[PDB]
Design a protein around this ligand. Structure first.
Ligand SMILES: N[C@@H](CCCC[B-](O)(O)O)C(=O)O
Ligand SMILES: N[C@@H](CCCC[B-](O)(O)O)C(=O)O
Ligand SMILES: N[C@@H](CCCC[B-](O)(O)O)C(=O)O
Ligand SMILES: [Mn+2]
Ligand SMILES: [Mn+2]
Ligand SMILES: [Mn+2]
Ligand SMILES: [Mn+2]
Ligand SMILES: [Mn+2]
Ligand SMILES: [Mn+2]
Lengths: 308, 308, 308
C-alpha cells in the first residue's frame, strides 16, 4: 500500500490567507524525503489548482460558498481516484473546510470507513447555527447523514452526498464548542473525548476506548482528520484559532502511534498550519516541524526506535 | 440557589500588601458579568470594610493577631447570613487567612459540611509551630477540633469555635509542607493527595477517591477553599508563595468541573491572587484570567460545551 | 548505611569538555550540606584524578579508548571499596561513559544487583554499530553478558568482565534510539518503558511494573543510573544531547521517590550535567538545581513533607 501526497493550498474557508502556504512549508521542512525513509513507497501528486469564483456572494451568512464548494468537488475526485488505485491519501492542509472533499472522495471507494477527528473544535455548525459564517467550522455538517435537510441548499455543494452517520465518528481534544454545536452532539449522540475526558482517563485509555467503539463490530478503513490546533498553543502556535489547555506533544504522538499500529489507516488530513502566523520565526518552525513529526508517526516512526 | 459575591480586600495575614487588590482585579476581568451568563442568579454584596487595629503587637511570633481576628469575625457574620438565606457564598481573596471567617460562618448554617483544600501548602501551623508568624499559613489550625487547646489563646480570636474534625477535610496539591505540619497530618490522620499521589493516580482517580472518602456515608455541603498557588507558577505566577511542580491548568479545571457535577457546592474561596506580583503585565493577566476560568467552572462552564 | 559522594570530572566519552565541571556545580549548589539534613550520614570522598593517555589513537571509529578505559578502571576500584564497607555510593557525573566503572565496581560486591536506567537513549551501541564513536553511548554494551564477544577487544578495557544479563535492567524515558540499538533490545528482549509506554500507562503504573519485573522473584541491590537528559529540555536544558518530549519534573521526582521507598538503593549515578551549555545563566541554574532535587529525593526528601 503506497502513499500519495496531495497538496491543497486553500484558504477561502476562513479569513486569513496564509494557510495557503501550509503545503509549501511542510514540503520545505523535508516532509517527502523523510516519508521515503519509511517502509512505504511515496508519491507526490503535487498541489491542486483551485478554480476561484469571481462573483461569490454570501449565502445568507456563509462566506465564499461557491469557491469552497468547487475546490472541494475537485479534491474529492482526486482522492477517490487514488483510493481506487489502492493507495493511502495524504492531504496537506489548507483550512479545514477541505475535509469535505477529502472525506467525500474517500467514502466513494470505502463507504464503510470511520472518522477520527483531532481538534479543539467540533466543526459541526450548520449554515443556520454558525455565527461567523466561516466554512472551516462547518465541514462535519455537510458530511453527516443525520443533518441532511436540516439547513437550506448551499450554492456550490449540490454535488455532496452525506456519507457518514453519527455513530461513525469520534472527536478527541475538544475545548471550544459553540452552544449550537453542543446541542447537536448531545442530541445526535456523537462520541467524543473532550479535554475533560482526556484528563479523567489518560490518553492511553482514550485510544483504547475509541478503537473498541469504532472497530468493535468489524474492522474497516480509518480516516484521520488532524487539525493542528488540537495540540496546545505552546506546541503548535502558528494556527488561526489557538485555544489554551490542549493536547501535549507527547499525547499527539501517542494518538498517531496507535493509529499506525492498527494497520487500518486509509486517509489522512494535516490541516490549519499557517506559516505567516508565528509570533516569531521559531514559533513557525516549531509548528511545521511538529506537523511533520505527526505525519511520520502515522506511517511507522516510533519513539522506541526503528530498524530495517 | 443564587450566588453571592463577597469581596475581602485583606492582606494582614502576610507581608505583601498587594493581595488587597485581588477582588478588584477579578471584577475588572469581568468576573460578575460572566457568572450572569450561567444558570445561576448572581448578587454582588460588594467588598467588606475591615476595621484595622492600630495597637496590634505580635502575640509571641504571631503578627497582626487582633487585626486578623477582627476581620475574620466580620466575614463569618456576613457569610452565615447569606447561607441563612439559601445562597452559595463566593469569597474573593485576599490572603488565605480569611478562610477562618469564611468556613466559620458557613459551618454556622451547615455544621455537616466537608472541606476540599487545593493548595501547595497545608496552612496548618499553630502559633507554636510557625516559624514565620504569618497567619495565612495557620487558618486550618483555628478550625480543627483536634487542635483545640493545643496552643495558647490568641488575641482577637476568642470568638472562634473549632468547627471541623480531621476526617472532614481533604488536601490536593501539597508540595511545600513544614516539618511541624507534616507531624500534625500524620498524627491526626488527615486525608491528602500531595503531588506524589496526583502523579501516581492521575487527577481522575484523585477526584473519585476524595468524593467517596467525604461523601461515602451520606451527602452534605461542600466548601472549596482554592489557593491559586495550588497550580504551577507557569499558570498562576502572580502569588506570594510560588512552588515549582504544581497542578496543571487542565488539572485545575478538572477539579472544579467535578465539584460542579456533584451539585453539592455550598461555599467557595478564591485566594492569594496578588496583581502587583507579576514579572510582567501578562503574568498578571494570566493569573487573574485563570482564577476567573476556575470560578466559572465551579458554576457550570464545561470544556465539552454548553447550551441553554 | 552511610552515603559516600564520589566525584568524576570526566569528558573523554564525548566531544564537549564542560561536563568535567558537573561535580563542581553540583557541590556549589549545596549538594553535600543538604544531604546532611537527611537521615543518612554523609561522606565526601572528593573528586578522582584520572590519568590521561597522551597517545590515544581511535580504535576503529571509537575515540579515546585508552583514556576512557583507564578512568573507568580507577572508578570501579574506588566504588567496590566503599561498597565493601557497607556504604551507598553516589557518583557525580561526568559523561555517561563512567557508568561502566560505576556498575562494574558495584557488581564486584553485589553480583545480584539490578539496574534502572533513566535516559532518552539506550547507550547500548557496540564499537561496530556506533556511528559517532563516542563512548558515552556505549556503556551498556560493555556490561551486558549477552553481548560478550559480539565486538572486537577494545584497548583499555581488557579489565572489564560483563556483569549483568539482559533480564537485569530496565530502561525508562527512551525516545532517541539508533537502528542498531533497537535491533539489539528487541533481539535480546530487554525490558523498557519508552515515552510511548509512559504515555500509555502513567508514571505510577510504570514504577509498579518495573519493580515487580526486577524484584518479583527476590529482593536485591538497586543501581540507579540517571542521565539528566531523561527529562524534557524545558527542565534540564544544560546537557549535550537534548531531546524533545521527555519526562516532566514531577515524573522525575516520582521515579526517585519510589526508589527511595523500596529501601534497596545501593548505587547512584547523576550524569551528563554540563554547566557550560545553558542558553542563559538561569538555564544552567535550572538544570543543576533539578539534579540536586532528584538526588535528595533518592535519599528521603518527599513532596508530602518530612519531620524528625
Ligand atoms: N466554531 C467556530 C470556530 C471554527 C474552528 C474551525 B477549525 O477547527 O477548522 O479551525 C466558528 O464556527 O467560527
Ligand atoms: N507554611 C509557610 C507558608 C504558608 C503558605 C500560606 B498560603 O498557602 O495561604 O499561601 C508559613 O507558614 O509561613
Ligand atoms: N546513540 C547516540 C547518542 C548517545 C547518547 C549518550 B548519553 O545518553 O549518555 O547522553 C550516539 O551513540 O552517539
Ligand atoms: Mn480547530
Ligand atoms: Mn478544524
Ligand atoms: Mn499556598
Ligand atoms: Mn493557602
Ligand atoms: Mn542520554
Ligand atoms: Mn546516557
Amino acid at each position: 500500500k503506497p502513499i500519495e501526497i496531495i497538496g491543497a493550498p486553500f484558504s477561502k474557508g476562513q479569513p486569513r490567507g496564509g494557510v495557503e502556504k501550509g503545503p509549501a512549508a511542510l514540503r520545505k521542512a523535508g516532509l517527502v524525503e523523510k516519508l521515503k525513509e519509511t517502509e512505504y513507497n511515496v508519491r507526490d501528486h503535487g498541489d491542486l489548482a483551485f478554480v476561484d469564483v469571481p462573483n461569490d456572494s454570501p449565502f445568507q451568512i456563509v462566506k465564499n460558498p461557491r469557491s469552497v464548494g468547487k475546490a472541494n468537488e475537485q479534491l474529492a475526485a482526486v482522492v477517490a481516484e487514488t483510493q481506487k488505485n489502492g493507495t493511502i491519501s495524504v492531504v496537506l492542509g489548507g483550512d479545514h473546510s477541505m475535509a469535505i472533499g477529502s472525506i467525500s472522495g474517500h467514502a466513494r471507494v470505502h463507504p464503510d470507513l470511520c472518522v477520527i477527528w483531532v481538534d479543539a473544535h467540533t466543526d459541526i455548525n450548520t449554515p443556520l447555527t454558525t455565527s461567523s459564517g466561516n466554512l472551516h467550522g462547518q465541514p462535519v455538517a455537510f458530511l453527516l447523514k443525520e443533518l441532511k435537510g436540516k439547513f437550506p441548499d448551499v450554492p456550490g455543494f449540490s454535488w455532496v452526498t452525506p456519507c457518514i452517520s453519527a455513530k461513525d465518528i469520534v472527536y478527541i481534544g475538544l475545548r471550544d464548542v459553540d452552544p449550537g454545536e453542543h446541542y447537536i452532539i448531545k442530541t445526535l449522540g456523537i462520541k467524543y473525548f473532550s479535554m475533560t475526558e482526556v484528563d479523567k482517563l489518560g490518553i492511553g485509555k482514550v485510544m483504547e476506548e475509541t478503537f473498541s467503539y469504532l472497530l468493535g463490530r468489524k474492522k474497516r478503513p480509518i480516516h484521520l482528520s488532524f487539525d493542528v490546533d488540537g495540540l496546545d498553543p505552546v506546541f503548535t502556535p502558528a494556527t488561526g484559532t489557538p485555544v489554551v489547555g490542549g493536547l501535549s506533544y507527547r499525547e499527539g504522538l501517542y494518538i498517531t502511534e496507535e493509529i499506525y499500529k492498527t494497520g487500518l489507516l486509509s486517509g489522512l488530513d494535516i490541516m490549519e498550519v499557517n506559516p505567516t502566523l508565528g509570533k516569531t520565526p521559531e514559533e513557525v518552525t516549531r509548528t511545521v516541524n511538529t506537523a511533520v513529526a505527526l505525519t511520520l508517526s502515522c506511517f511507522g516512526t516510533k519513539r522506541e526506535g526503528n530498524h530495517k
